[PDB]
RNA sequence: AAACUUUCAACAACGGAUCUCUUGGUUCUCGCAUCGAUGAAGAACGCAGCGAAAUGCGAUACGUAAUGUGAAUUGCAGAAUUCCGUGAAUCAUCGAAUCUUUGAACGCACAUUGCGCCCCUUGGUAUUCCAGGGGGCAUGCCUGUUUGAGCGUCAUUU
RNA sequence: UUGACCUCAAAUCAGGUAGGAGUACCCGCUGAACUUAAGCAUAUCAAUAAGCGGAGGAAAAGAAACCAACCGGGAUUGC
RNA sequence: AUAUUGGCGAGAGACCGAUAGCGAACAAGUACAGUGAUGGAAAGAUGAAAAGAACUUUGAAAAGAGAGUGAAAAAGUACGU
RNA sequence: GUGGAGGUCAGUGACGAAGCCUAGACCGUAAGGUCGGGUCGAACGGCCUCUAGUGCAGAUCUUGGUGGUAGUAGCAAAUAUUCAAAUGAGAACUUUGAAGACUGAAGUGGGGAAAGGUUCCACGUCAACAGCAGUUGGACGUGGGUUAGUCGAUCCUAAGAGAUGGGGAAGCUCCGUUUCAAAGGCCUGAUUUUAUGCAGGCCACCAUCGAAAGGGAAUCCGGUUAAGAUUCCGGAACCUGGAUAUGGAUUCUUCACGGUAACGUAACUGAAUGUGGAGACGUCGGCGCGAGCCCUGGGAGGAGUUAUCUUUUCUUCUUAACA
RNA sequence: CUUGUGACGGCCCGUGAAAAUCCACAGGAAGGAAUAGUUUUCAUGCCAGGUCGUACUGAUAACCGCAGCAGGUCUCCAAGG
């Protein structure tokens, strides 16, 4: 059982918030009934449903922030790339490709020609 | 030490939970090689040294 | 009576738990751990202690974050998500 | 009597009980059980009955 | 051979002086404008025994000429100085017992 | 003559040798370059219906989201619509997240679950007191902004 | 009086950046002794072990203030 | 072009075969000792499948004697030989 | 003769390979080889060559296991146990009753600090431990239990430790704790576009850590649990911090009066700054005073002895913090 | 008898901690009344007081002496003859 992720994504934040506070309610009363019956595996689906809603709530919030910071430098660090420490510090392909005027003229004038040795 | 720090009392709780025999349903799983709780401790023979 | 009678007077922990390694080797008076070198920034380690390095080297723990870096590298550190092929 | 998260203090416990159960709290006593959990002793005002609240929660 | 005793004192592990009960460093009043141009007056308040010192201390109270405070000095008591005695320190002080000419 | 000792054989003991297996190790060869202040390695404590350990994970806690596969898991119970399907699985993959207290560890400390300060907000008849929620306050150094200090020093005055 | 310059500070000032781990290989510093010499001090073990600082998938070196003495060769690296 | 007892991914051996081979084929850097730096094990094999002995009887009970499963209880969780 | 490798005997083998036992047999001088018989259940051999971690009685050899000694040495300090009943299959050791004893208040009592860590208490339970025993347990299995504005920590500083500014050291790090520092907040008022910069003024230690016996704000009594209490319940208090309203006080001589005086009261403005006090203190001897305990009279209740005597012997009659 | 306390006396070439914290005084900046003020060291009146330890032994058995070892381990209360 439990709530599925895809149909939650069609909701809004207030509906999700109402869903969450409702979800936390039964987990309370399932927990008090857990000590009554010898076993109750139904609580597992309840807790997972809370996680699914919480992920959905977070997912919507970040995307709206991403749209807010779209198209301008200095985005929040957690929304940046998490490749490595080294790669983030590495030279970008633009700056690595930069070359002085003296060398650019030599490359354009004298590139490595394609030659064949048969005759 | 009746008057003890919370850190020591936190190590207290885990030791209480550790000291418990093997659950019986562990015996019945397929390819079960565990015979008993080998890491059992008792206050008379082994001290925690914490 | 340096033997049994003297052994009875041992009730003062010279060391306690280390905040960094949790070994019960933190010297209370010296305020320095004798195992991991806390509070010094560098972790205590010696090349003559070949066994000692092996006990606390990387791999003996969880690699809470470094487990997946090889998996991430194999995919070339892709970004985004799948597309329901 | 309630089991409470070890990060909660008496202010939060008093705040929460009157929230979920809409019942005023006289005083709160807390202790750490030997198993590592926190146990809260919440005393309700004489205007309210603990037994009536207890089975309303679902245990008695 | 083993390090002999007189060497071992220099490290100052247990050979430092026991200074718990001393009332303070017995120094004269600092040399300022008043003393090198005139004289200043003081009052002997306490004649205290100093721990580890045979001579007694004289505890003289002075007035700060620049701020309204009551700078208190610790002298080494000379034979014949009594409590409540006025003490004169400075270049123009009269030659009397306890003065700091 | 019996008992007893000793020798031998059968059976039975003690003990675990030999024989036969081997998800292990060792050695050699080939390919790749990927840790961390966007918080590493390591530590502590916790999380399952029934778990002590190993493994997994972090109050979203043997896990959530996404994709692929296509009907399970299993010791028991339970759950079934999940079965011609946006769909079982302790499945595989893995790009989105969560990630307790720590730790280079960064408000100050730490043998304490100690003590602070700033902003927004809520309640307590409150800018000052108290409490709750959220976000912050390390060191060195670089570039740039702002405010400055120095008869170090110029010009400009009256 | 006003405005510059130079030097030096302060900002929870706008951006960054360094610290730790691993260390088989790599770049340096520091640095022994056992042992051999049928003893032993120079020597040898050894410009090694331990210790300390610093990177990458390689590092380092690298295009002669070179080798040569020949009819001269021609960065570095390795067999 | 060179190095690499580390890390990741692979292929092999006139290598070793549970007192061997890594200390560790197993909940091994674990249990355990030391105040501490550190030191540091032992421990693999029922059976094809638990089919792990229903039931009767003696005993307070553990168990024994029967009965039974099994190709084999001269395989009975102290289990290959 | 052994482990492994190349080649061959289209070698042996679940109709039983290897291994193990066999005063059963055969061959070789021997190292050894072959067969029969019992157990056994999955691989192994003959020959030509190759290769080695290849042959054990010793090494006070290593690891593991087992003997004689041997049912032996022995289980003898701490004065001491006995009868009956109950549970129980089983009682010298368990429970209860009775009896005899001991510790004898610098205890075998009642609590604590360091340490231990659930040993505390309950239920069931005796396979191993309690060097006999065991129905018992500090054992085994399953659970319960630790409540604080006033008790401690947290706060302060002591001997001491230890950053920063600095200066050494190749470096890990060392020295130093106010030192060759541009080392900050304190309060009042203005502004009510408005939040707080300008108005001012003020001050000079200049991190931090360091005591569960040093210093320190404030709680007592009664009752309750299987196990908690100065923490829980009832009652009665106190301290700190903060918002305040009333009453009281004082004022037209604006910030009170009285007493000669020591001084008294219900209050009875007071910033910067300075001074003082408390915190804050050795040891011994005797003396005075207080509290508790001990002794004892009268009386008010209860119990014991009573062949005889004993207005007798023992016991209850208590009053916290705070005002 | 134990203990607290007061006033004393003896002893020293020994004269027998510091800090946090609280109060008072000196001071007179400032603010203050009459148709109304001033006053929160007087009384009453309201609210809050977080966090962590709290069980038990403390020893011829709960600590260290490999152990249920005649050993060692700081302290409080102490009836009658
Ligand atoms: Mg001692
Ligand atoms: Mg010490
Ligand atoms: Mg508490
Ligand atoms: Mg020699
Ligand atoms: Mg020689
Ligand atoms: Mg020699
Ligand atoms: Mg080295
Ligand atoms: Mg290079
Ligand atoms: Mg170069
Ligand atoms: Mg020991
Ligand atoms: Mg057989
Ligand atoms: Mg068999
Ligand atoms: Mg024989
Ligand atoms: Mg056979
Ligand atoms: Mg088989
Ligand atoms: Mg050999
Ligand atoms: Mg032999
Ligand atoms: Mg021999
Ligand atoms: Mg031998
Ligand atoms: Mg005998
Ligand atoms: Mg004897
Ligand atoms: Mg006494
Ligand atoms: Mg008990
Ligand atoms: Mg026995
Ligand atoms: Mg027995
Ligand atoms: Mg230092
Ligand atoms: Mg402190
Ligand atoms: Mg204290
Ligand atoms: Mg004192
Ligand atoms: Mg009191
Ligand atoms: Mg008690
Ligand atoms: Mg009460
Ligand atoms: Mg009056
Ligand atoms: Mg004083
Ligand atoms: Mg009274
Ligand atoms: Mg006394
Ligand atoms: Mg005296
Ligand atoms: Mg208690
Ligand atoms: Mg208690
Ligand atoms: Mg007790
Ligand atoms: Mg005691
Ligand atoms: Mg005692
Ligand atoms: Mg012990
Ligand atoms: Zn450590």
PDB file of C-alpha atoms (C1' of nucleotides) and ligand atoms in Angstrom, chain I residues 225 227-229, chain J residues 55-56, ligand 31:
ATOM      1  C1'   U I 225       6.920   1.793  45.989  1.00  0.00           C
ATOM      2  C1'   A I 227      12.618  -1.609  43.714  1.00  0.00           C
ATOM      3  C1'   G I 228      12.547   6.231  43.549  1.00  0.00           C
ATOM      4  C1'   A I 229      12.742  10.172  46.480  1.00  0.00           C
TER       5        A I 229
ATOM      6  C1'   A J  55      18.813   2.472  41.265  1.00  0.00           C
ATOM      7  C1'   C J  56      22.618  -0.731  44.208  1.00  0.00           C
TER       8        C J  56
HETATM    9 MG1  LIG K  31      16.833   3.607  48.177  1.00  0.00          MG
END
